[PDB]
């Protein structure tokens, strides 16, 4: 079973990438997203008809009333990058067992870069093991977030507290920043308002690299995909180094 | 035609920079820097190519300023090996190598090279801009309200310039961030409508001018005047504000908002 999950997840990512390349740098984003999701679901359910799938547009789908295994997909995380021709969007694939991610992929189909997190294994990038880096203090950390405008109210005030303590705040890449953290080139990622399909795949990738990823109180990020689950918004903080993670939590004051 | 020889040599210079840069990119995941080494070495590689071919030309960069075997030169190569140092340091492959050739102070050739992604935009006076040898064009945009805007960082504005940037920012469809010269490359290929930045040095923008103009775009200072900087033995690398647009009409609306 466990190899079979990895093999099928790769086949699904391959199918999504084949689709996406037909649309990149030509509604195109919507057509690409829908076609890539269909391609992934076909692969998944051909192999695992007892599983369920979950995505943004169509929600939960399962040919049975329940499933132990659920695939949570986002064909194009980073829609604004995609629309503007910037090749740092990603396809996100998470497989959840009883609501817990056991596999996550971040795939960049243009750059041909694929991060794979699997419970039990070290994360890989194009098949080679990766690791997060240590970081001596928050003042030395390189921080990413997608946009300064994707924070409001109390969350913006919290972000600013962290932002003003790091070495430098950088912007613009969605899931790719978490990939770079997993590979040891970024120290901290702080975001507000992510939906489950935008973060679940990140969890095994980051943890399997040696990093930490939680909500802004430091609690486990969890969203159990089910027939009745509601795709609510989450705040996320990821770090390469546990000590920097705790400093970030202390600054967020959430 | 001498511009074809200049193009050939510029391409050899970009190839040499890229070979250096690929040796150093994503070497820093174990906690002088790789970025300084890479930058210096890449500049040296380009300079060697340029001056092997053109001993009567000058070169100009950030660290060393003006260099020439003679006291003056008609042709000056202005170089930035790594535009987007923070992207380079953090493993984000959207920095670029910038090469501009100036004849009597005016850019006649510009390259934006991404050596990891293997994407090279070339602007040559007289020709349409190319990306990996294929012609490119900017796109039309119906109104500032429909424009996709990029800038490197929200924090690279201060004072009156920040206030002017905010006026534009709040009028566009969406403001996006993070990628230095690469945003101007995307504008040249017709995927971005507007780029607005403050505080660029000449090695950060001269290469952009032939690229953007040769794709059908417009690039000026914030008053709508020509961006001009004559590289010379006594020139000072001062800071400039830049606005680039795919569409002339959007450019003017942006100038109207900047109120500079
Ligand atoms: N990656 C998050 C979704 O982007 P998209 O919907 O453009 O694909 C970006 C984000 C950060 N905070 C809130 N949303
Ligand atoms: N591309 C400009 C230079 O970046 P670098 O010095 O990190 O390479 C970014 C910039 C915008 N406004 C001011 N500077
Ligand atoms: Mg997503
Ligand atoms: Mg520069």
Written as one string, the DSSP assignment of B112-157 is EEETTTTEEEEEETTS--EETTEE------S-GGG-EEEES-TTS-
Task: Mark yes or no for CB contact B191/A87 under 8 Å.
Answer: no
Give how far Cα B149 sits from Cα of A219, B119, B145, B167, B168, Å.
36, 21, 10, 13, 9
Task: State the structure-solving technique.
Answer: X-ray
Total residue length of chain B: 260
Q: A97: helix, coil or strand?
A: strand
| Interchain contact A197–B (C-beta under 8 A) | no
Whether A239 and chain B come into contact, CB under 8 Å, resolves to: no
Contact between A94 and A203 under an 8 Å Cβ cutoff? The reply is: yes
Closest approach atom of ligand 1 to CA A78: 8
Instruction: Output the known binding site of B.
Output: 62, 80, 82-83, 204
Residues 6+ apart with CB under 8 A from A121: A208
How many angstroms separate the most distant Cα atoms in chain B?
Answer: 51
Greatest Cα-to-Cα distance within chain A, rounded to the nearest angstrom:
51
Touching check for B89 and chain A: CB below 8 Å? Answer: yes
Q: Say yes or no for a CB contact (<8 Å) between B91 and A183.
A: yes
Distances in Å between the alpha carbon of A122 and those of A9, A206, A210, B28, B71? 17, 10, 8, 19, 59
Q: Would the CB atoms of A185 and B30 count as touching at under 8 Å?
A: no
Q: In which residue are the tokens 């977030």 written? A: A145
User: Which chain A residues contact residue B150 at CB under 8 A?
Assistant: 84
Bridge partners, residue B56, by sequence: none
Distance from CA of A191 to the nearest CA of B (A): 15
- Number of residue pairs across A and B with CB atoms under 8 Å? 82
CB-CB under 8 Å, A180 with B92: yes
For ligand 3, the distance from its centroid to the CA atom of residue A161, given in whole angstroms, is 26
**Is B223 part of the contact surface with chain A (CB cutoff 8 Å)?**
no
CA distance B76 to B235: 12
Contact B222, B200 (CB under 8 A): no
Q: Do B94 and A86 touch (CB under 8 A)?
A: yes
Residues with C-beta less than 6 Å from any ligand 1 atom: A 77-80, 146, 150, 174-175, 191-194, 198
- Resolution limit, Å: 1.4
The DSSP bridge partners found for residue A188 are A143, A239
> Of A91, A97, A103, A71, which Cα lies nearest the Cα of A208?
A103
Ligand nearest to the CA of B152: 2
3-state secondary structure of B168: helix
Inspect the interface and report whether the beta carbons of B182 and A142 lie closer than 8 Å. no
Residue spans of beta strands (DSSP E) within B5-164: 58-61, 65-67, 75-83, 96-103, 106-114, 119-124, 130-131, 134-135, 148-151
Cβ contact A85–B191 (<8 Å): yes
Residues whose CB is less than 8 angstroms from the CB of residue B177 and which lie 6 or more positions away in sequence, other chains included: A147, A148, A171, A172, B150, B151, B152, B153, B154
A54 touches chain B (CB under 8 A): no
Q: How far apart are CA B68 and CA B73, in angstroms?
A: 8
Q: Name the residue among B90, B153, B179 with its Cβ closest to that of A186.
A: B90
Give the closest of A130, A133, A172 to B177, CB-based: A172
C-alpha A146 to ligand 1 mean position (Å): 7
* Geometric angle at alpha carbon B170, from B164 and B175, rounded to 5°: 100
CA-based nearest distance B176→chain A, Å: 7
Which residues, listed in sequence order, are joined to residue B134 by a DSSP beta bridge? B131
**Which of B29, B92, B186 is the closest to A184 by Cβ?**
B29
Among residues B227, B178, B179, the alpha carbon closest in space to that of B203 is found at: B227
Chain B contact for A167 (CB, 8 A cutoff): no
**Residue A99 touches partner B, C-beta closer than 8 Å:** no
**Domains in chain B, CATH or no CATH each:** 1-136 (3.30.540.10), 137-260 (3.40.190.80)
Nearest to A185 among B29, B174, B189 (CB): B29
């Amino acid at each position: 079973q466990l190899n079979h999950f990895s093999d099928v997840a790769n086949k699904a990512a391959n199918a999504a990438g084949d689709v996406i390349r037909k649309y990149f740098r030509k509604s195109p984003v919507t057509i690409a997203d829908q076609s890539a999701e269909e391609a992934m679901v076909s692969v998944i359910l051909d192999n695992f008809p007892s599983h369920a799938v979950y995505g943004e547009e169509k929600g939960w789908r399962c040919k049975q009333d329940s499933a132990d295994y659920v695939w949570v997909l986002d064909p194009i995380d980073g829609t604004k990058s995609f629309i503007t021709g910037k090749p740092l969007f990603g396809t996100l694939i998470a497989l959840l067992q009883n609501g817990t991610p056991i596999l996550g992929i971040i795939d960049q189909p243009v750059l041909k870069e694929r991060w794979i997190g699997i419970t039990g294994k070290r994360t890989t990038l194009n098949g080679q093991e990766v690791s997060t880096r240590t970081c001596a203090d928050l003042s030395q950390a390189y921080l990413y977030t997608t946009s300064p405008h994707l924070f409001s109210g109390d969350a913006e005030e919290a972000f600013i507290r962290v932002r003003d303590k790091v070495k430098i705040p950088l912007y613009g890449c969605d899931c790719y920043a978490y990939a770079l953290l997993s590979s040891g080139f970024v120290d901290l990622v702080v975001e507000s308002g992510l939906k489950p399909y935008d973060f679940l795949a990140l969890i095994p990738v980051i943890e399997g690299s040696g990093g930490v990823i939680t909500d802004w109180k430091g609690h486990q990020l969890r969203w159990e995909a089910s027939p009745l689950s509601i795709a609510t918004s989450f705040n996320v903080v990821a770090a390469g180094d546990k000590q920097i993670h705790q400093q970030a939590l202390d600054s967020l004051q959430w």
